Amino acid sequence: RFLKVKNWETDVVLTDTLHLKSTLETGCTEHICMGSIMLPSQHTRVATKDQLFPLAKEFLDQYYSSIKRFGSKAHMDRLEEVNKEIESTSTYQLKDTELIYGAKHAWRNASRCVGRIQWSKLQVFDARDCTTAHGMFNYICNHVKYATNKGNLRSAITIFPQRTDGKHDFRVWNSQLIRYAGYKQPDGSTLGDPANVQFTEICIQQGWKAPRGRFDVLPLLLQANGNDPELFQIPPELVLEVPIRHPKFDWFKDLGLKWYGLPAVSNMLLEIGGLEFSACPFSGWYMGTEIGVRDYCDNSRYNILEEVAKKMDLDMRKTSSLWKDQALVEINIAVLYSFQSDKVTIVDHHSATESFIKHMENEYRCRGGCPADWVWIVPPMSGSITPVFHQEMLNYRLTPSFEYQPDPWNTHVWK
Amino acid sequence: RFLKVKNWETDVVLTDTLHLKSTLETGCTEHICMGSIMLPSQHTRVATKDQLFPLAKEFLDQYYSSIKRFGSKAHMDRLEEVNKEIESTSTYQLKDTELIYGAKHAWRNASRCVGRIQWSKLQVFDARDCTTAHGMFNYICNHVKYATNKGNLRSAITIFPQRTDGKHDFRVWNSQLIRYAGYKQPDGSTLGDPANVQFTEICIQQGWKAPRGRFDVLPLLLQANGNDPELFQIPPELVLEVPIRHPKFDWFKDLGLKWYGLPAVSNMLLEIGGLEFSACPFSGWYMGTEIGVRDYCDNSRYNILEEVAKKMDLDMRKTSSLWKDQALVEINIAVLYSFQSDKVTIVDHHSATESFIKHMENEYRCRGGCPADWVWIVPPMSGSITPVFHQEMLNYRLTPSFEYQPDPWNTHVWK
Ligand code: HEM
Ligand code: HEM
Ligand SMILES: Cc1cc(N)nc(COc2cc(CCN(C)C)cc(F)c2F)c1
Ligand SMILES: Cc1cc(N)nc(COc2cc(CCN(C)C)cc(F)c2F)c1
Ligand SMILES: C[C@H](O)[C@H](O)[C@H]1CNc2nc(N)[nH]c(=O)c2N1
Ligand SMILES: C[C@H](O)[C@H](O)[C@H]1CNc2nc(N)[nH]c(=O)c2N1
Ligand SMILES: [Zn+2]
């Protein structure tokens, strides 16, 4: 009841008691582990008034434990107050301070997030007064501007009104506020980002005039209070982009690559005290490998290890020449170099993973544990030369949390 | 009750029913996943006559199902026969054919093993007639010779007598039949393999005269039927070694690296029909990354990314120059190149991981599933440019199996 995780590179041993507070299930049973299923049925998201008070009570008891005033009158009053409001309205509302705590701790509890050392320094924009897609677009634009901070990126989340009935639902339909378009070709090949082609067509469906290149920033599709979503173009001056050059290969400019500075995940669901915020875009800054490895080099993403290795003049005949590995390291040197030379906040997968081990030490000391998904924490290149490879991580689901949710067009009852 | 695993790079979907046959537990519960604990208490190994027949019956019912003659008289007789022998002797003995099946399927069931596409082509040397450390040493030498096959490596396992009481126990004390010695220094640094220093001293304890270099092949320490283990030097002509050169950097010879051709894991436990074979060395051929990444570049292993990157003339000031990544790809190009140019069987982590996906297809088709540990199947470099990164794997514990077991010197009641 007091589990142990070891680092096999440092012989460090931490003791995890925090998992005792754990609430939701994982997908693993005693006789099967599913630690590598991408979107388990547990990580995906309609609740009633009955279940809503335990979740409200549980969340509130830890929020007052957080600000050192647990069990007091201001606590016991706030429990009655929300109890009373959940009888009266079969839902309730979070105090501005309860939102900021809740959100911060959904990030803190994200076991698949390697950059959580910064969880406390999160900026919460309370957009619960929003009512229109235009209001969303305005809130989202001020997010983009603030979090971008001219390359000196800042963590932020903008929280649109919580789900109520379920049919009046705020959603960003984008998977990220900034993503490049994806267009299929005559021969069935793909220009742009193959991940988004389904979304790119949904935008053209609703009227997007596509410039039909690679790195075309998509418009925002914003569903407000259940109504049909509406296209909005982020002002280009607000979308900061790093053109990718290499600090050796001058032909790497002619590759003509670039990425947006701001990773800002928009399509997920924030759970606080049993309340569901269906739109809650959040942003940080990139780890280099998300762009250099996954975006640029996944097979069904930009798939550039081909053209890069060509220009490197690499033994591409044999699989065992490791030409794919060689061209991958250069591509990530270029991403990190490019972002740093434009003063745009980026972190390499070595620095990010050491900070996470430093963060894990804090969380097992001043909190008793740190839920961690090794399958997701280990960078997708040079796994074992980074210190997270050798660290055992206990994965469990705490709340407040971020949950996946179905894409809106699979569920949205249209006009 | 018919779980689904998806490949997110190919959209391939397999259906796992084989996990229904699963028997032992994993360490994960509904509310915690431990898929990244190295040696869970389940994966580590005294049984009574009561429990011994279900395990005997379960194993035999699948062995006759294997050779198409399930439920027949030869089956029902063999069940009575072993039932009778487990009453009479509170243990039993495997037919030569039941050993070969059992062993092959312990390899087949090893969910952490990426090279299992070859599980059926395993050579089983039945050393259950062995009684002395000298007999062990002779059996082990014929293993080494056979599996090495002059660089054209072959899979093999040598099975010493099964555990009985528990105090008469055959054990190879080596973790592998061939490993380099590790000696600590005046300044506390380490010459050789830091992993083995504890073992290297136990050998010098029992009388090993150490040549005190790096790549000094350790002697065998062989415990036979419970008696004190005894040192034996594998004839050097039997220990094939690849000196590591690079196909560009002529200063990579002057690095002076070399590795043994034969990976041969000796310290683990083979479970067949509830029977425990405490000594069962098994060997295949290397994946390149086990040497180039883990051996050569783990921090507490040979830790050569230092000296290699120096000679590469690399930006070692900044962590974010990715100099560690750059020097790692070259080191693995050199290992693969070196082994191939000496006609010594080696596989690159790209070829090995594609074969495993091909193998996974066979196992979900002609068997209903394939237990797989993603944390261990994904190569420790260039994770996501290999197809196992994107494949969901169901991990479960089938039997016959290989289990870890405590090291003998922590348990051996000495003389
Ligand atoms: C501050 C810089 C940040 C960095 C470097 C970072 C890095 C990462 C990385 C590399 C992943 C793995 C996902 C992938 O590779 O596709 C991830 C996942 C995630 N991060 Fe962070 N992130 C940051 C900020 C944030 C913020 C501000 C939040 C929430 C407000 C957050 C919450 C999450 C969540 C929910 C996931 C996915 C967990 C899941 O899929 O279940 N992160 N992050
Ligand atoms: C034929 C070539 C083979 C290759 C390329 C191969 C490769 C690997 C690799 C890369 C690992 C991960 C361990 C690590 O990286 O430290 C592993 C684990 C393992 N392999 Fe294989 N192997 C081969 C043959 C065999 C054979 C012949 C057996 C059994 C007779 C076997 C059974 C296992 C077991 C039991 C494990 C570890 C599972 C655990 O720790 O629970 N493998 N193998
Ligand atoms: C704020 C932030 C910063 C950063 N540097 N990186 C990220 C990446 O975050 C996520 C990535 C995915 C991709 C999931 N895949 C199946 C497509 C799903 C999520 F839910 C995430 F939160 C986020
Ligand atoms: C036959 C074979 C071929 C091959 N190419 N590689 C291997 C590696 O197999 C193992 C490696 C370890 C290291 C475990 N670590 C904690 C030190 C533990 C085991 F039980 C293994 F079976 C085996
Ligand atoms: C199949 C597997 O779950 C899937 O590829 C996961 C593995 N680990 C990951 N880890 C991170 N950080 N990001 C990912 O997208 C994935 N994908
Ligand atoms: C902590 C973690 O379980 C440990 O480092 C594991 C991770 N995955 C691995 N995978 C392989 N193939 N070999 C290993 O030694 C390990 N080590
Ligand atoms: Zn699990």
Using CA atoms, how far apart are residues A198 and A181, in angstroms rounded to an integer? Answer: 10
The pair of structure tokens assigned to B188 is 């506390």
- Residue B222 sits at the vertex; the CA angle it makes with B216 and B225, to the nearest 5 degrees, is 175
With tokens 């487990």, the residue in question is B86
Picking from B310, B309, B283, B305, the residue whose alpha carbon sits closest to that of residue B295 is: B305
Using CA atoms, how far apart are residues B85 and B83, in angstroms rounded to an integer? Answer: 5
- B16-128+155-165+269-283+353-377: CATH architecture: Alpha-Beta Complex (3.90)
Using CA atoms, how far apart are residues B231 and B235, in angstroms rounded to an integer? Answer: 13
Please list the residues that pair with B123 across neighbouring strands: B156
Using CA atoms, how far apart are residues B266 and A107, in angstroms rounded to an integer? Answer: 44
Angstrom distances, CA of residue A276 to CA of A94, A164, A281, B79, B261: 11, 8, 14, 58, 57
Element of type H or E holding A253: helix A251-254
Element of type H or E holding A221: strand A220-223
Picking from A320, A399, A384, the residue whose alpha carbon sits closest to that of residue A107 is: A399
Give buried/exposed letters for A221-254 (b at 16+ CB in 10 A, else e). bbbbbebebbbbebeeebbbbbebbbbebeebee
Residue A141 has φ and ψ, to the nearest 5°, of -65, -40
Picking from A302, A280, A348, the residue whose alpha carbon sits closest to that of residue A180 is: A302
Using CA atoms, how far apart are residues A302 and A291, in angstroms rounded to an integer? Answer: 10
CB–CB of A123/A156 below 8 Å? yes
CATH superfamily of B241-263+286-351: Nitric Oxide Synthase; Chain A, domain 3 (3.90.1230.10)
CB–CB of B266/B283 below 8 Å? no
Using CA atoms, how far apart are residues B265 and B258, in angstroms rounded to an integer? Answer: 19
The pair of structure tokens assigned to A152 is 């000196």
CB–CB of B79/B87 below 8 Å? no
Handedness of CA B17, B21, B26, B29 (dihedral sign): positive
Q: Cα B141 to the chain's mean position, in Å?
A: 18
For chain A, the residue count is 415
Q: Which of B42, B347, B375, B377 to mutate to test the pocket of ligand 6 (most atoms within 8 A of CB)?
A: B375
Give the closest of A32, A298, A328 to B26, CB-based.
A32
Picking from A336, A306, A154, the residue whose alpha carbon sits closest to that of residue A244 is: A336
**CA A361 to ligand 7 center in whole angstroms:** 23
CB–CB of B346/B285 below 8 Å? yes
A149 class by beta-carbon count within 10 Å (0-12 exposed, 13-18 middle, 19+ buried)? middle
Q: Residue B120's CB: how many other CB atoms inside 10 A?
A: 11
Give the closest of A34, A381, A394 to B34, CB-based.
A394
Largest interatomic CA distance in chain A: 73
Cα Rg, chain B, nearest whole Å: 22
Residues 6+ apart with CB under 8 A from A32: B3, B19, B22, B26, B28, B394, B395, B396
How many helices (H) and strands (E) chain A has is answered by 12, 18
Residues of chain A with CATH 3.90.1230.10: 241-263+286-351
Residue A3 has φ and ψ, to the nearest 5°, of -70, 160
The pair of structure tokens assigned to B81 is 């026969």
Residues of chain A with CATH 3.90.340.10: 16-128+155-165+269-283+353-377
CB–CB of A20/A31 below 8 Å? no
CB–CB of A133/A232 below 8 Å? yes
- Ligand 4 within 6 A of B281 CB? no
Kindly report the nearest CA distance between residue A383 and chain B, in angstroms.
5
The pair of structure tokens assigned to A310 is 């060509």
DSSP label at B236? G
The pair of structure tokens assigned to B186 is 């005046």
CB–CB of A370/A404 below 8 Å? no
Using CA atoms, how far apart are residues B245 and A324, in angstroms rounded to an integer? Answer: 20
Using CA atoms, how far apart are residues B94 and A265, in angstroms rounded to an integer? Answer: 58
| Dihedral class, residue A23 (left if φ above 0, else alpha if ψ from -120 to 50, else beta) | alpha
Kindly report the nearest CA distance between residue B81 and chain A, in angstroms.
31
3-class SS of residue A208: coil
Picking from B216, B218, B228, B204, the residue whose alpha carbon sits closest to that of residue B266 is: B218
**CA A160 to ligand 7 center in whole angstroms:** 34
Using CA atoms, how far apart are residues B159 and B127, in angstroms rounded to an integer? Answer: 5
3-class SS of residue A45: coil
| CA atoms within 13 Å, Cβ hemisphere of A314 | 23
Give every strand in the sheet of B269-272, ordered side by side. B275-277, B269-272, B401-403
Using CA atoms, how far apart are residues A217 and B378, in angstroms rounded to an integer? Answer: 33
CB–CB of A125/A99 below 8 Å? no
**CA A247 to ligand 6 center in whole angstroms:** 34
Instruction: Identify whether B116 is a catalytic site residue.
Output: yes
With tokens 């594998």, the residue in question is B234
**Residue A118 is which amino acid?**
Q
Using CA atoms, how far apart are residues B211 and B158, in angstroms rounded to an integer? Answer: 29
Instruction: Identify whether B113 is a catalytic site residue.
Output: yes
Picking from B115, B107, B119, the residue whose alpha carbon sits closest to that of residue B388 is: B115
Element of type H or E holding B244: strand B241-244
Angstrom distances, CA of residue B400 to CA of A74, A280, B105, B274, B283: 60, 49, 6, 8, 18
Please list the residues that pair with B260 across neighbouring strands: B241
The CATH code belonging to domain B129-154+169-240+404-408 is 3.90.440.10
A175 class by beta-carbon count within 10 Å (0-12 exposed, 13-18 middle, 19+ buried)? middle
Using CA atoms, how far apart are residues B92 and B85, in angstroms rounded to an integer? Answer: 6
Using CA atoms, how far apart are residues B154 and A33, in angstroms rounded to an integer? Answer: 32
Using CA atoms, how far apart are residues A215 and A415, in angstroms rounded to an integer? Answer: 32
Using CA atoms, how far apart are residues B229 and B133, in angstroms rounded to an integer? Answer: 7
B169 class by beta-carbon count within 10 Å (0-12 exposed, 13-18 middle, 19+ buried)? buried
B321 touches A: beta carbon within 8 Å: yes
Residues 6+ apart with CB under 8 A from B114: B287, B352, B353, B356, B376, B377, B379, B388
Using CA atoms, how far apart are residues B63 and B400, in angstroms rounded to an integer? Answer: 11
**Breakpoints of chain B, after residues (C–N > 2.5 Å):** 45
How far the first Cα of chain A sits from its last, in Å, is: 52
SS3 content of chain A, % helix, strand, coil (to 5): 40, 15, 45
Kindly report the nearest CA distance between residue B300 and chain A, in angstroms.
6
The ligand with the least distance to the CA atom of A393 is: 6
A286-287 and A346-347 strand pairing: parallel
Residue B4 has φ and ψ, to the nearest 5°, of -120, 130
The pair of structure tokens assigned to B160 is 């010493």
Largest interatomic CA distance in chain B: 73
A385 touches B: beta carbon within 8 Å: yes
Give buried/exposed letters for A178-203 (b at 16+ CB in 10 A, else e). bbbbbbeeeeeebbbbbbbbebbbbb
SS3 content of chain B, % helix, strand, coil (to 5): 40, 15, 45
How far the first Cα of chain B sits from its last, in Å, is: 52
- Ligand 1 within 6 A of A352 CB? yes
Give buried/exposed letters for A40-50 (b at 16+ CB in 10 A, else e). bebbeeebeee
Residues 6+ apart with CB under 8 A from B251: B311
Please list the residues that pair with B265 across neighbouring strands: B176, B282
Using CA atoms, how far apart are residues B293 and B304, in angstroms rounded to an integer? Answer: 10
**Residue numbers in B near A33 (CB within 8 A):** 26-28, 33-35, 394-396
Using CA atoms, how far apart are residues B172 and B127, in angstroms rounded to an integer? Answer: 13
Using CA atoms, how far apart are residues A7 and B36, in angstroms rounded to an integer? Answer: 11
3-class SS of residue A98: helix
Angstrom distances, CA of residue B28 to CA of A33, A375, B215: 6, 15, 40
Please list the residues that pair with B217 across neighbouring strands: B180
**Interface list for B 265-294 with A (CB within 8 A):** 288, 293-294
3-class SS of residue A180: strand
3-class SS of residue B45: coil
Kindly report the nearest CA distance between residue B42 and chain A, in angstroms.
11
**Residue numbers in B near A348 (CB within 8 A):** 319-320, 322
CB–CB of A86/A348 below 8 Å? no
Catalytic residue selected from B108, B116, B171, B179 = B116
Residue A255 has φ and ψ, to the nearest 5°, of -55, -35
CB–CB of B323/B307 below 8 Å? no
Using CA atoms, how far apart are residues A240 and A237, in angstroms rounded to an integer? Answer: 7
Picking from A272, A269, A301, the residue whose alpha carbon sits closest to that of residue A172 is: A269
DSSP label at B336? H
For chain B, the residue count is 415
Using CA atoms, how far apart are residues B157 and B134, in angstroms rounded to an integer? Answer: 18
Residues 6+ apart with CB under 8 A from A7: A13, A357, A387, A390, A391, A392
Helices A49-66 and A73-89 cross at an angle (nearest 10°) of 160
B187 touches A: beta carbon within 8 Å: no
3-class SS of residue B358: helix
Residues 6+ apart with CB under 8 A from A86: A49, A52, A53, A56, A92
Using CA atoms, how far apart are residues B254 and B269, in angstroms rounded to an integer? Answer: 40
3-class SS of residue A79: helix
- Residue A121 sits at the vertex; the CA angle it makes with A292 and A279, to the nearest 5 degrees, is 70
Give the closest of A29, A33, A336 to B320, CB-based.
A336
Using CA atoms, how far apart are residues B182 and B212, in angstroms rounded to an integer? Answer: 8
Q: Residue A409's CB: how many other CB atoms inside 10 A?
A: 16
Using CA atoms, how far apart are residues A331 and A347, in angstroms rounded to an integer? Answer: 15
B346-347 and B286-287 strand pairing: parallel
**Residue numbers in A near B322 (CB within 8 A):** 329, 332-333, 336, 348, 350
**Residue numbers in A near B350 (CB within 8 A):** 319-320, 322, 324
The ligand with the least distance to the CA atom of A400 is: 1
DSSP label at A43? S
Using CA atoms, how far apart are residues A143 and A148, in angstroms rounded to an integer? Answer: 8
Residue A127 has φ and ψ, to the nearest 5°, of -100, 25
Q: Residue A258's CB: how many other CB atoms inside 10 A?
A: 14
3-class SS of residue A186: coil
The residue contributing the CA closest to ligand 5 atom 12 is: A376
B13-16 and B3-6 strand pairing: antiparallel
Using CA atoms, how far apart are residues B364 and B370, in angstroms rounded to an integer? Answer: 6
Residues of chain B with CATH 3.90.440.10: 129-154+169-240+404-408
With tokens 């569901």, the residue in question is A276
Q: Cα A215 to the chain's mean position, in Å?
A: 21
Ligand 4 closest atom vs CA B38: 16
Please list the residues that pair with A397 across neighbouring strands: A24
Element of type H or E holding A257: strand A257-260
Picking from B276, B271, B225, B262, the residue whose alpha carbon sits closest to that of residue B141 is: B262
Using CA atoms, how far apart are residues A200 and A25, in angstroms rounded to an integer? Answer: 35
Picking from B381, B251, B256, B389, the residue whose alpha carbon sits closest to that of residue B326 is: B381
CB–CB of B22/B398 below 8 Å? yes
Using CA atoms, how far apart are residues A116 and A159, in angstroms rounded to an integer? Answer: 19
The pair of structure tokens assigned to B192 is 């050789």
